[PDB]
Amino acid sequence: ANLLTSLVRAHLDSGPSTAKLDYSKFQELVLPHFGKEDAGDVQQFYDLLSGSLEVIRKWAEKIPGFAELSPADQDLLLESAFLELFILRLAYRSKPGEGKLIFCSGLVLHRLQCARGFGDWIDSILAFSRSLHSLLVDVPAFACLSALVLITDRHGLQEPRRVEELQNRIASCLKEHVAAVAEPPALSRLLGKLPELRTLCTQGLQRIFYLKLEDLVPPPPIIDKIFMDTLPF
Amino acid sequence: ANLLTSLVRAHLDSGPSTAKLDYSKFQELVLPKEDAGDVQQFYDLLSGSLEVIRKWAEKIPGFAELSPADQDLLLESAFLELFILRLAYRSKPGEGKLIFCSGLVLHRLQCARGFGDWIDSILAFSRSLHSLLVDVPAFACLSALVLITDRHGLQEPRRVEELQNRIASCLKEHVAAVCLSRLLGKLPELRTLCTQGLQRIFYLKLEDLVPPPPIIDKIFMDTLPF
Ligand SMILES: CCCCCCCCC(=O)c1cc(O)c(O)c(O)c1
Numbered sequence: 414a415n416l417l418t419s420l421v422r423a424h425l426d427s428g429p430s431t432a433k434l435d436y437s438k439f440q441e442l443v444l445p446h447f448g449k450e451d452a453g454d455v456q457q458f459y460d461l462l463s464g465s466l467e468v469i470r471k472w473a474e475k476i477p478g479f480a481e482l483s484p485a486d487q488d489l490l491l492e493s494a495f496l497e498l499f500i501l502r503l504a505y506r507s508k509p510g511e512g513k514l515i516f517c518s519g520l521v522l523h524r525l526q527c528a529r530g531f532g533d534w535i536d537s538i539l540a541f542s543r544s545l546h547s548l549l550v551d552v553p554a555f556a557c558l559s560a561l562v563l564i565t566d567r568h569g570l571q572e573p574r575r576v577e578e579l580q581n582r583i584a585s586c587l588k589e590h591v592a593a594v595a596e597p598p599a600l601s602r603l604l605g606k607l608p609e610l611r612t613l614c615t616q617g618l619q620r621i622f623y624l625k626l627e628d629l630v631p632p633p634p635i636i637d638k639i640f641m642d643t644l645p646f
Numbered sequence: 647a648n649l650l651t652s653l654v655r656a657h658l659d660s661g662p663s664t665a666k667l668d669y670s671k672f673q674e675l676v677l678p679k680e681d682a683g684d685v686q687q688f689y690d691l692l693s694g695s696l697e698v699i700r701k702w703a704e705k706i707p708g709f710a711e712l713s714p715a716d717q718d719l720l721l722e723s724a725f726l727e728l729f730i731l732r733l734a735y736r737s738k739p740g741e742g743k744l745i746f747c748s749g750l751v752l753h754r755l756q757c758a759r760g761f762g763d764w765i766d767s768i769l770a771f772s773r774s775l776h777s778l779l780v781d782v783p784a785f786a787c788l789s790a791l792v793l794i795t796d797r798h799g800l801q802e803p804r805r806v807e808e809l810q811n812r813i814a815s816c817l818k819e820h821v822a823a824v825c826l827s828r829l830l831g832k833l834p835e836l837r838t839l840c841t842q843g844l845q846r847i848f849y850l851k852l853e854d855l856v857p858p859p860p861i862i863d864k865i866f867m868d869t870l871p872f
Binding site for chain 2: 618619622625626644
């Protein structure tokens with residue numbers, strides 16, 4: 414499809430090539446003081462989140478039809494889907510067999526270098542990365558799934574039906590692609606992994622809550638807004 | 647002191663007698679994350695501690711002669727940390743058994759489900775508190791010190807600090823009559839344990855199997871610096 418193509422091109426452009434990975438701050442072994450953190454750790458955590466949102470916005474806008482939605486709908490879909498998108502894209506990108514996390518800037522950091530600011534969450538993201546990698550999801554299938562995480566029913570949408578339409582389009586796209594490779598829903602093996610992902614979004618929220626308590630440095634406003642908006646109370 | 651006496655009397659009156667401990671629901675054994683009944687029990691147990699602590703606080707000399715707002719503030723800010731400290735002092739971590747202020751006795755596994763990790767950390771603190779072997783008068787002073795302390799928003803911060811000083815003198819003289827800061831060193835880690843409490847409630851509030859009781863929920867929100 415020209416849709417699939419658009420989706421894949423959008424995806425690849427939203428992340429680094431093996432060519433341009435950034436190992437400058439990579440350290441194969443760091444010795445941290447666990448269960449505890451300084452302001453630099455927390456800043457880096459927030460910076461990394463912030464960087465993903467900016468990248469994800471730009472990625473979202475290259476999804477056909479996404480850019481035509483109500484501006485409020487655009488923001489809503491992006492806020493509701495951000496953590497889950499951050500985790501999924503990071504898990505798909507990273508190499509858990511080397512304990513290394515790869516961010517969308519190309520930045521490469523090791524489990525131990527993130528342990529301070531992310532806490533346990535980073536270990537659990539890595540566990541998910543393993544389990545994701547074991548179902549072997551090709552880039553076009555991923556380019557569809559990521560879009561599907563974003564483009565989905567959320568409470569408060571102004572034009573729920575346009576969103577559902579755009580959902581339907583992307584789901585067909587995925588279906589045809591899956592048939593092109595191997596005539597099917599299948600998929601259920603992958604959805605079996607989706608509880609792990611929900612849980613990981615919760616951990617994310619819990620971590621931010623905790624850092625917000627501690628307040629060594631305050632969250633960036635956009636991240637803080639998402640934190641608050643996505644709380645069902 | 648008549649102060650110390652007042653503090654000790656207040657403390658002892660605020661919990662169960664070995665006589666009236668309630669082992670009815672105690673179970674040594676069980677198995678095997680949590681359901682609504684676990685969460686309800688957690689909130690019930692917190693709720694049960696509330697009114698006991700207000701009544702205890704009012705028997706502290708001078709406490710009752712603070713601004714009503716200051717009274718409520720000091721109580722809301724100190725509730726979790728008081729619940730934890732009194733529970734840790736009261737419980738027997740060697741036997742894995744938690745004793746609540748109703749006299750209810752439960753085993754660490756019987757409330758692991760609803761407290762999560764926090765219960766282990768409370769029990770860890772209980773061990774550590776006990777190793778210091780803190781006698782009842784010293785405890786009666788410490789608990790008061792957790793309550794009567796600087797909080798953001800106090801109307802009469804200095805009266806509170808004066809009352810602090812009084813109680814700290816009381817404690818110091820008592821320890822000498824019989825560490826001087828080994829027990830005071832405990833309070834920092836109690837704050838940390840409060841944090842876990844908050845984190846747990848946040849988590850339960852996310853999953854929402856049952857909502858918090860209003861009074862507990864109010865404390866949760868009011869004690870958030872944002
Ligand atoms: C690998 C673990 C699962 C990750 C991929 C699943 C994507 C999320 C998903 O299917 C999904 C589920 C919905 O109910 C929905 O309305 C949507 O737009 C997408």
